Structures are given as C-alpha cells and as structure tokens.
Design a protein around this ligand. Sequence first.
Ligand SMILES: [Mg+2]
Ligand SMILES: [Mg+2]
Ligand SMILES: [Mg+2]
Ligand SMILES: [Mg+2]
Ligand SMILES: [Mg+2]
Ligand SMILES: [Mg+2]
Ligand SMILES: [Mg+2]
Ligand SMILES: [Mg+2]
Ligand SMILES: [Mg+2]
Ligand SMILES: [Mg+2]
Ligand SMILES: [Mg+2]
Ligand SMILES: [Mg+2]
Ligand SMILES: [Mg+2]
Ligand SMILES: [Mg+2]
Ligand SMILES: [Mg+2]
Ligand SMILES: [Mg+2]
Ligand SMILES: [Mg+2]
Ligand SMILES: [Mg+2]
Ligand SMILES: [Mg+2]
Ligand SMILES: [Mg+2]
Ligand SMILES: [Mg+2]
Ligand SMILES: [Mg+2]
Ligand SMILES: [Mg+2]
Ligand SMILES: [Mg+2]
Ligand SMILES: [Mg+2]
Lengths: 394, 131, 63
Amino acid sequence: SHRKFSAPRHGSLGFLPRKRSSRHRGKVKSFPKDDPSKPVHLTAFLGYKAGMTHIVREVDRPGSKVNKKEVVEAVTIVETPPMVVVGIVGYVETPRGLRTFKTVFAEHISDECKRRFYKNWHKSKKKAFTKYCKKWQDDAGKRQLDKDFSSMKKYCQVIRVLAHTQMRLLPLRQKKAHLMEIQVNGGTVAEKLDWARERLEQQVPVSQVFGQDEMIDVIGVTKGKGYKGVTSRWHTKKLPRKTHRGLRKVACIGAWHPARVAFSVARAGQKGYHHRTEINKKIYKIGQGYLIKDGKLIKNNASTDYDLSDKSINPLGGFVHYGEVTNDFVMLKGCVVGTKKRVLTLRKSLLVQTKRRALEKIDLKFIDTTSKFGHGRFQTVEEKKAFMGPLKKD
Amino acid sequence: SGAKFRISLGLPVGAVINCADNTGAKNLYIISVKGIKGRLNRLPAAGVGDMVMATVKKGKPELRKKVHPAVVIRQRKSYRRKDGVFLYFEDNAGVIVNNKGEMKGSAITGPVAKECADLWPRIASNAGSIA
Amino acid sequence: MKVELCSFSGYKIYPGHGRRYARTDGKVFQFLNAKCESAFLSKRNPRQINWTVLYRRKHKKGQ
RNA sequence: GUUCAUAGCGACGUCGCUUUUUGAUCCUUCGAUGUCGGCUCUUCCUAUCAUUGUGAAGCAGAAUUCACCAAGCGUUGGAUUGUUCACCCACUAAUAGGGAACGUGAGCUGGGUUUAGACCGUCGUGAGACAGGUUAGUUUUACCCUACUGAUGAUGUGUUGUUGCCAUGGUAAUCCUGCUCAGUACGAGAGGAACCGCAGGUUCAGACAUUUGGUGUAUGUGCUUGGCUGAGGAGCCAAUGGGGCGAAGCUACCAUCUGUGGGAUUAUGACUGAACGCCUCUAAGUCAGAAUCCCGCCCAGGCGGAACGAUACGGCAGCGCCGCG
RNA sequence: UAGUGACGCGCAUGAAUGGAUGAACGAGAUUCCCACUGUCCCUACCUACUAUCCAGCGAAACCACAGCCAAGGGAACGGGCU
RNA sequence: AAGGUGAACAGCCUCUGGCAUGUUGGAACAAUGUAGGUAAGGGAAGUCGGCAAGCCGGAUCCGUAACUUCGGGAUAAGGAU
RNA sequence: AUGCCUGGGCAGGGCGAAGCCAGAGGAAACUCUGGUGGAGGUCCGUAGCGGUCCUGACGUGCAAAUCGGUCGUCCGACCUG
Ligand SMILES: [Mg+2]
Ligand SMILES: [Mg+2]
Ligand SMILES: [Mg+2]
Ligand SMILES: [Mg+2]
Ligand SMILES: [Mg+2]
Ligand SMILES: [Mg+2]
Ligand SMILES: [Mg+2]
Ligand SMILES: [Mg+2]
Ligand SMILES: [Mg+2]
Ligand SMILES: [Mg+2]
Ligand SMILES: [Mg+2]
Ligand SMILES: [Mg+2]
Ligand SMILES: [Mg+2]
Ligand SMILES: [Mg+2]
Ligand SMILES: [Mg+2]
Ligand SMILES: [Mg+2]
Ligand SMILES: [Mg+2]
Ligand SMILES: [Mg+2]
Ligand SMILES: [Mg+2]
Ligand SMILES: [Mg+2]
Ligand SMILES: [Mg+2]
Ligand SMILES: [Mg+2]
Ligand SMILES: [Mg+2]
Ligand SMILES: [Mg+2]
Ligand SMILES: [Mg+2]
C-alpha cells in the first residue's frame, strides 16, 4: 500500500558510493574546455587550508536592503606557495578515450619531489632519475629529447604540465611534496608545448593564473568521521523512546515481494573522507607572502586601505592546529571542504561567469586578527599591551 | 523592493506570546504561520516581522474565541543580522493586525525590531522604539 | 565600522564578535561573550568584579 | 445549454477496462506463512491536484473548467476517534488517486479485535451465550546463507612506485513571494494581466566552525555541604558530591558557504508540395519546439588499458639486450 | 466520534436479583487547567559497562542439497526447471 | 550494635574488625546498545493516553476554599526566611 | 491453603479523642480562652511484608519468574520459626 503522507527522501542518490576516498590529494575530473584564441595559462593550483576568520566589506547590490552597508562574512585562508614545474605530459585523442602519449621530465628534480617516488625515504638509496638526467647532458640524449618534443608537437592535442608544491616553505610536519598534472590552455599545441618547455625548472606564483574577485572551484577530500550510524550518516528520523531494539535506526528496510534491500535504502557505514568538488568560490583577496627588503614585511597580509596597520592574517598565537602562514595565500569566501593542513586543489570555473554576484568587485575594509584559540578580544599584541599596560612578568 | 533576509525562527505553532498593544488582549496563542509550505512532522515557526494567525487566550472577552492575524514584534531567540550582530529582546511580543497590514490597536509597548519596522510601515508608524 | 564597548566589562567589541541585548524598558546593551552576559543577567555589580575595567578605574589600578 | 445535439453536459439503449471495494470458488498452507491500525523507510503506477510546453470555450482581462506529450519534482501542521474511513481549524501552487503477501511486529507500539479475572443490559430453569458496551491483561531468538552498507583483499601486468585515461553503474535540484513592467494591455465600469530584468525566500542536497548557541570529566579555574589527614597550608572521599565560568574537539537552517550546460525530439504550431488541374504540417523533403529522454558538471572506478623512475654488488648471488649453437 | 451540564422518545434503566445519594480514602477508569520539562519541532554532546582487537578458555539452536535476479509455466508467489 | 552530620537504627564519611571488586587480563574509545546526564527558542504542537523524565520537596514564620458524616479536607492552595 | 499449641520482632516524626488544671463571661443552664493528656483496624516514613508502572534490564538469563528505579502497607484482619 502507498505511504500515508508523502515525504522527500533523505540523502542524494548521486553521491552514494560512501567509501573512504582512495586518494588523498584532490583530483580534477575535468579541466576547462580549451579554445585556441586566448593566451597560454594554467588552470589548477594546490593550496593548504590554514584557517578561517572574519571580513568587513561594503555591498554594491542595488535594490537590496544591504546596499552600501558593511557586512561581516566568513572567509577561509588557503596558503599557496609557488609551485615548481618538473615535466610535461602529452595526450592523443582515441575512439576508446584519451591516453597519454609521452612524458618528459626536467634534468633537475628537487628532493621534495623525489619524496613522492619512495614509500620509505629513510631506507631508500635515493636512486630515482639517476640515469634519466644523463639524457639532458649528452648529445644522443638531447637528440632523443628533441625528437620527443617534435613528436608531441606533431601528434598530441592535450598538453599537461607536472608541478610539485614546496613543502619546505610550509610549517607542516610532512616533507613529501604533492605532484599534480596541470592542463595548459591557450594557443596552438606548438605554442603551449614551447611555453611549458620554457617554464621547466621554474617557479609559478599563484597570482599569475588566479585574480581578485574571481569565481573558482575547490577540490578536496572531506573530514573523516569514521563509522557512523544511519541517523548521522543519512539524517533519518529517530524512532521514539519506546523502541525496543534501538531507536537510531531505520524501521522499514524494504518490502516483501522484492526479496532484497535496495541500494537506495539508508544504512550505516563510513561517513566523511569523501572526494567533493564545490563550485563558485569567490577570491576576496590574494595575499603577498613574507618578503624582506630591509626588515620583515608583514602588513600586506591583513592591512587594508582603511586599516593601514601592520597586522598579518595569522591570529594571535597563530592559526589553531596549523601554524603560521608565511608564503602567499588566497582568501576564499565561505567555507571549503577538508580539515586543517589538508591539501586543496584550486580549479578555474567551467562555466561563463555573467552574474551580479559573480562580477561583484570586492573591496576589503577590515580583517579580524583576534586569536582563534579561545574568545580573543585583541587584534594585535601591541593593542593588548597598550590596553593592559605593564604586567608582573615585565 | 527590499528583501527579508531570513533569520532564526524561535516561535513555533503553540507558542504563547504577550500582546504589546492597547487593544486589551494579554496573550497571543500562535496557531499557524502564514507563508509556510511545510515539511513532514515539521512544526511551522515564525520570526520577527512575520504574519501569523493568533488567538487571544486571556484578556477582553470580545477578542477571545476567534482567530486574529498578528505580526511578531520581539523574540527571545537570538538572530543574526547581515552586519554580524546577534540580537534578542528578552521577551516575545506581537500585535493584532488585519489582512492588509493595518494595526487594530493604536500604541505599541516596548521596542520594535527593525526588520518588522521596515517590512510593516504601519507598525513602524506607531512604534516608540526601533530595534 | 563602529566598535562598541561591553556594558559589563568595558572592552571594545569588534563587528564579528559580541552579542546584542535589548531590554523591554527600551535600553540596549552589548556584551563581549557569555561570561559578561551571564554576569549581567545575574545582577552582579561590575564594580565588584576584579577583572572589569570599571573595577580598576574605581580602585585606581595601574597607571 | 437565451437561439444551437456534441464550448460544457447528456436520458432511453449499448460496448468495454481495473482488481486500490464488497462478493462467488475452495486451488496452495491446519507436524503453524505471527492479523487491525499508527510510526519509520524505499521504490513503483497514472486513472495529472500543482509546476514545465500546448490545444477549447457560453476565454474581453482576471478567473474558470475540457483535452494532449508528460510521474522530473512536490502533495503540509493540528482538535475528535484504535481506527482504515470521516469532519472541522490554518497555511499553501496543491494539500491528486493507488500498489509493493490488503509493503513493512527476529523494525517499534499494543489503542481495538482475540484466551484466562471481573461489571452492566438482553436471552436461558441452569451451567452459560451475545459483529452488545466497560475495565486489567509477558510481543522470544540472528553468531548461519543470501541481499544491502561499508573495510581488507584477489587473477594478470617480470617486481615495485608515480602520474593519468576510460568502459561501465548512480545522478539533482525544486517551487514561491516582493519591486519595475503597471493601475498598463483588456474592459461601460467594477476590476485587472504577461515577457525580459532586480531583490529575495520554501523544500532538498553537499560541506564547514570565523562568528552565535549546545556539549564539556583537558575533571581547567574559582565557590561551597558532610566526613577524613591534630590545626594553618595542601588535599582526598561522598560510582562525575553539588553548583558558576570555561580551552580544544564534535555539533545546530539554532551560525555560515555552495547548487550549473548542450543534443535529439513529444504534444503542438508551421514551410514547400502532390495524391485529388483547387486546397492541404505529410506522402518524399524541411523549421521552431518543453519540469520529457540522453549526455555534459558531479560520485565510484573492469579478471581494462597508457606513459614514466628504480630495478637486488653480497658475505653466497641473480638479472636485461645481441647472435649462434 | 472525547469530557461535563440539561431532554427522554429508555432496542434492552429501576428499587436488598437493591434504587438514589454520599464526607474521607484508592499503585482503580476518564476530561480540563497551572507549573514543569528533549514527548516533539530537531537533534547534538559527555560519562561508565559492552560491542571492537589480542593472550588463555570456549558452547548451543539449526542443517534434504545448498544459497545472485526478471519473466514464463507449474500444487494457481522458485535457489534449482525454460 | 562506636564517632561525625543529621529528627532518626534515613543517606554520606570514619574507628574496631573484614576483603580484593565478586568463573580471567591487556590495547583503543567505531556504529548500535544497557545505565546516568546536559541542551539555545517554543512548552505536549509527540503519543491511544504527559509513557518516561522533569517540576515541588526539610525546618521556621503567615495564610488556607468548596464540601462534609463536623471527626476531616490540610503539608489544601498561596507567600517570606 | 486453613485451624490449634509454644516462642521471636516491628527506627524517627505529624494530626491531636476521652479525662484533668487554671483564667474569663453568666442569675442558672452552662459557654469561651490557654494549658496537660496520648486514643486511633490514624497519616509520612525505615526494617520487615507485598509486587503498580517503566508493559525497563534479561529473555539458549544471575535465575525452569531474577534484577534497577519507582511503588502499597508498616500497632493490626501485622510478620515470622
Ligand atoms: Mg503518495
Ligand atoms: Mg518494549
Ligand atoms: Mg576556536
Ligand atoms: Mg484567462
Ligand atoms: Mg499486511
Ligand atoms: Mg518481517
Ligand atoms: Mg514481535
Ligand atoms: Mg489491549
Ligand atoms: Mg476476559
Ligand atoms: Mg433470567
Ligand atoms: Mg584548608
Ligand atoms: Mg533543443
Ligand atoms: Mg528539430
Ligand atoms: Mg509534425
Ligand atoms: Mg483532548
Ligand atoms: Mg427489567
Ligand atoms: Mg439489575
Ligand atoms: Mg526454497
Ligand atoms: Mg567493576
Ligand atoms: Mg578480579
Ligand atoms: Mg530545551
Ligand atoms: Mg510518570
Ligand atoms: Mg483537595
Ligand atoms: Mg518487559
Ligand atoms: Mg539478548
């Protein structure tokens, strides 16, 4: 018989292989479509979730009650030190798919990149790419590399570049760099190949590809939560207190005549650590990392045109469970998937951005730097010392 | 042209709020909230500035035993504004209104939240304090 | 932005933080956190609480 | 139906479909297949209530009903009754109809049927009977197989590692309000639209804790009752002694963020053009065409492949290419 | 469709097969109101013991053979047959 | 049949006396459980039914209605310390 | 299960029946006020006795009927060898 009262189902059937993610680094399933009219550029980057803070900004939406009004919005900080290009990969179209054609690496590979090639770096002899680099310093090897580049230019239609992060500049415990293919979109195949070859063994800052007030995509893995019940995994209704054999369950698993439980029935299992791809994340501010000309330059992280202070994005005592942000960082509106120290993949929008919200210009007015390790109440140590005055430990 | 900017709802069906006008009514028993599509087993709830159907439980016998439209003036539930401040009013209050938004009474006791004042000009006209 | 002063303690309140309380008589108060809000709602006098700014002003602490 | 059989209905007659009603039969089950409802949950049907696209008027606008492709997404909160059913209050675009052993008791409950104790009314001499009422009346077991949810893994790739492709499966977004249009089109007046735009909301899905709230045994820091270390100090016991405030972590439309594009076309409306010297969307050919279907975005990744690095100096060893036995 | 207060037309009320009433009392059966609260909106978090893994010790129920589905026919609802 | 608190042979702590936590120990703190709790706003809207939980609670000083078999109701109810 | 014989046992509090004393009013009949008194198949409540609810735990159990909270009674038609 039909159910007495209709109700929408719990959860989405389009998201339910609910398995612990096989990969840790976020994966770009589909790069932006390539058109041979715009200049060459990258479409992906790797960052690390540092923390979250406030923002103050005037709204510029006519007709809204919030027009020309200051608002407080949550923003997340993603530290993005520059990446190093180490190789390129070519692809050829096939009626079966798109298989890789040829991969060429650079003569010099950093130890951080070589960390990824070994499961046990301590026990390893660090022999990776020992014979490969002999090609770059020999006439026969140079001729072979020239032939490889010519073949990729003649046959390949999709070109991707291998780049790795600089884990030395991060405060994280791990030292193994993250290596990812980044697709180069731009002019013809030859132009993209030559541009990628020029960028070999070179650092690519994040500001080259991403700009201010731009909608991007964030790709990463969700926070892991282990084995969870159906009440928490699928947000089903709880049975009343009188229930004998447990109330944090689903009462009717299925019907009789189909003598199986369908795949659409909510059940207990792994919750969290799922690969996700969010869309329409707006870049409020692209920050400049610590640099030294005479002394330290820390103002640019958290100084605005209205504050003009020497603050940094790091709160008092630093970011909780992450550390201190020293390199370049990207400020995204709202929240992103993953926990602290989680590597996040920044991807360009796959859609044309023509909207009032998408084209809105962002002008920061104030950045909150109060300590997140408790109920902070002072922006800087100087303000705290001025308010409190001298203490016993002086 | 202005929007509503939804806030936390803390007055479900069955809540009894005190009337804040000189009509004579003392309490307003909320029986439903206008403009609620509804979900299974979900009790409709009302924020400040929302039209509701209310019934007077104690007060003048004329107003009792019938349904009156009402608009919530204050609520103890702390709701977030677009500028990042959470506000609550220490008491839940409302006034008896008609279908077109004209108040039945003539004076309002206590402050009125700015959301209700902006949404209902007639209420804001007789409001003594705003927010 | 206009920074507010806590009605109980006296510290500055930034737009992100704090909590606003409107009394029925027609007065509005600002609180840093649940500590000051609970102290205020319990009718505790701020001049008897050592860490409040008003107490330090009363006792001429510092300076 | 003012005139007019077919805008909308339709008697007297007649032809059908369904097993979501009660019936007829006793074919399976009496070495036992746990029943009526309610709660929870998934899926399916269309005989379409609303939304998308359209044809019709006794369609001027608004509104209204008739019909077509169409089940993608929705179809609510309560008073009474165990109730299915039923009626009312309120909101809403709508509160459409049903199946899945009259879905669902090793999922729950036991309110009513339906054991044993009793009360009332009727019947009987009586023991007792009553689709007549009332009251109290034990709801067992999964550790087996499959199915499902997740987690190790497995055959080949000489061994390992990195970066990737993809066949296949799942799939998702939905509806409403306010401003302008516009008191305009329309209309004697009363009344009274729509498209493109702007600001937002409901339901749903995926996240996250900067802020607000919750939790709190970091048993963190004060304050306290009774007792115990002779007392002060410092502490302990009273299954977490009690009570304030409370870090981090989890967590709430109870805070915050995000939710997408093409192709083929259905109904329909058309172009050219005969059959049928005329006319015709159709016969040949062609156009526009949607909550429809498929795919893209998204999630998983084949007893499925690809490129690249190192490939066992040893104290015994073992390999990789070449040719010729 | 509950409860209470009035009517009697009482299928089938009625006077020790006792009628009516009635203070106090009742782990007796019902209605409403005040306060209260996670019963609920709408769930979350914390504690102890299990469940989990390990060392040792270690049963029972049950068992034609066994165990992936759609439709057909069939003892008119199949894991086996097509 | 001791001391303290306490109206008390109530509950809690202690002395004389007794014992090893009740047919085993170690490592983590997943889901479901069993036993305790806390929850912003609403306050029974849940359910057949306020089931369960919660609210009140000791003592002192005030005050205490209808009804009644005049005995009660009664710690009625409601206040302050 | 019931009768009989012979033994044992049942904290701490509340309400306050007869009887009695003193004071005041009355012409008498007698009536009020404040005390004393401790009766009751009296009340709260422990031990004991029993088993309403959670239709809780368990339900190849600790147990062929036990366990936790909450409960009725607890000077008499009381409980018990
Ligand atoms: Mg339905
Ligand atoms: Mg039960
Ligand atoms: Mg924090
Ligand atoms: Mg019309
Ligand atoms: Mg059935
Ligand atoms: Mg079953
Ligand atoms: Mg059962
Ligand atoms: Mg029953
Ligand atoms: Mg019986
Ligand atoms: Mg007879
Ligand atoms: Mg001391
Ligand atoms: Mg099309
Ligand atoms: Mg076409
Ligand atoms: Mg056609
Ligand atoms: Mg009722
Ligand atoms: Mg008779
Ligand atoms: Mg009789
Ligand atoms: Mg069989
Ligand atoms: Mg123990
Ligand atoms: Mg032991
Ligand atoms: Mg609460
Ligand atoms: Mg109870
Ligand atoms: Mg009484
Ligand atoms: Mg039981
Ligand atoms: Mg069991």
